[PDB]
Amino acid sequence: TAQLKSQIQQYLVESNYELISNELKARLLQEGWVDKVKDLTKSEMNINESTNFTQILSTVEPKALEMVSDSTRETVLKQIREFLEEIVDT
């Protein structure tokens, strides 16, 4: 069943989530990605002459996802994966 996933996630919460979230934030912040996303947002708001959240998000999210550096991406994935091999059976 797929209740398993939610269960595992609950365990993840009770235990380390902060360390991951914080390291991610620090990495994205330090490499300038956050401010790039701010500039992108101001630019899109100015181009579309709109503050409507849904339409701006619709254009912002994919690109913002692409803008994540490979280093940060693979490092954070690597770390989560490191944390996962602890508490699952194969």
Partner 1 sequence: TIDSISNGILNNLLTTLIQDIVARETTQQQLLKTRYPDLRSYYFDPNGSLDINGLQKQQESSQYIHCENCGRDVSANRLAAHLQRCLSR
Partner 2 sequence: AMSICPHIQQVFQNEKSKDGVLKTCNAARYILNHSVPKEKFLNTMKCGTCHEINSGATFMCLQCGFCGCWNHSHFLSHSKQIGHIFGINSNNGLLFCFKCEDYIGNIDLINDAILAKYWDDVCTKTMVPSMERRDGLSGLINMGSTAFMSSILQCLIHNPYFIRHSMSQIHSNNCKVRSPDKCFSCALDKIVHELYGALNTSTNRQTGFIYLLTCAWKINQNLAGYSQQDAHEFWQFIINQIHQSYVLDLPNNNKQCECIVHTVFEGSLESSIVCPGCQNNSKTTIDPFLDLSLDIKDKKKLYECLDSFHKKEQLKDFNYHCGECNSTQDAIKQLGIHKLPSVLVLQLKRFEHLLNGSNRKLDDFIEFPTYLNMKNYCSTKEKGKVPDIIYELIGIVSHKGTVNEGHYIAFCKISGGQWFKFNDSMVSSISQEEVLKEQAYLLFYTIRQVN
Partner 3 sequence: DAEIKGIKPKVIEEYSGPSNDSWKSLMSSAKDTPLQYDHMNRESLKKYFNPNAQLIEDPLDKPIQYRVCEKCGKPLALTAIVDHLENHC
Distance CA 56, CA 85 (A): 38
Interaction between residue 4 and partner 3 (CB under 8 A): yes
Question: At a CB cut-off of 8 Å and minimum separation 6, what does 26 contact?
Answer: none
Interaction between residue 32 and partner 2 (CB under 8 A): yes
Interaction between residue 14 and partner 2 (CB under 8 A): yes
Among 27, 31, 36, 37, indicate the residue that binds partner 1 (CB under 8 A): 37
Binders of partner 3 among residues 16 to 55 (CB under 8 A) are 18, 21-22, 25
Distance CA 21, CA 81 (A): 14
Interaction between residue 65 and partner 1 (CB under 8 A): yes
